[PDB]
Amino acid sequence: DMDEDEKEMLSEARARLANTQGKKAKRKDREKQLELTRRLSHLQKRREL
RNA sequence: GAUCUUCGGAUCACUUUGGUCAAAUUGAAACGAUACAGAGAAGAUUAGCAUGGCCCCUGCACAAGGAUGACACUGCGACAUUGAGAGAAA
Ligand SMILES: [Mg+2]
Ligand SMILES: [Mg+2]
Ligand SMILES: [Mg+2]
Ligand SMILES: [Mg+2]
């Protein structure tokens, strides 16, 4: 337990240090990812037609 | 027509029309239904003020609210070289 719990906090800390984007960065990129993914299906409909 | 007065002749009164349709689908609000997604500040929860306009609603308002109303970028570069080595073209 004690060896295991030390290794958990050591991995959680590597996440904190790694990313600074915040809520607005993550939600703004998903909007890009949805719009881009939406087109690829929409453009295939144009070639299909 | 009326009043004077020769049956002539006077005199009074003078050009309307507020129209985005000439008869409610195809010429002046959009919202609503549905589907998805589902709320700032570098752990998580959290008050806010501003900031900039081809974004705007509520409001008599130069009060105040509306998520802090919402939305918001950050490669370039006015190009020097040094010294050496290799390559193709004069
Ligand atoms: Mg306000
Ligand atoms: Mg808030
Ligand atoms: Mg409020
Ligand atoms: Mg504001």
List keywords for this structure.
1 chains; 49 residues; mainly alpha; 90% helix; elongated; binds magnesium ion; RNA-binding; rna binding protein/rna; Spliceosome; U2/U5/U6
Task: Describe this protein's structure.
By secondary structure, the protein is mainly alpha-helical. It contains 2 helices and no strands. The chain is elongated, with a radius of gyration of 20 Å. The termini are far apart. It binds magnesium ion (MG) (4 copies). It binds one RNA strand of 90 nucleotides through α2. It is found in: Nucleus. This is Pre-mRNA-splicing factor cdc5. Belongs to the CEF1 family. Involved in mRNA splicing and cell cycle control.
Secondary structure blueprint with pairings:
Blueprint: H1 2-18, H2 22-48
The structure holds one RNA strand of 90 nucleotides.
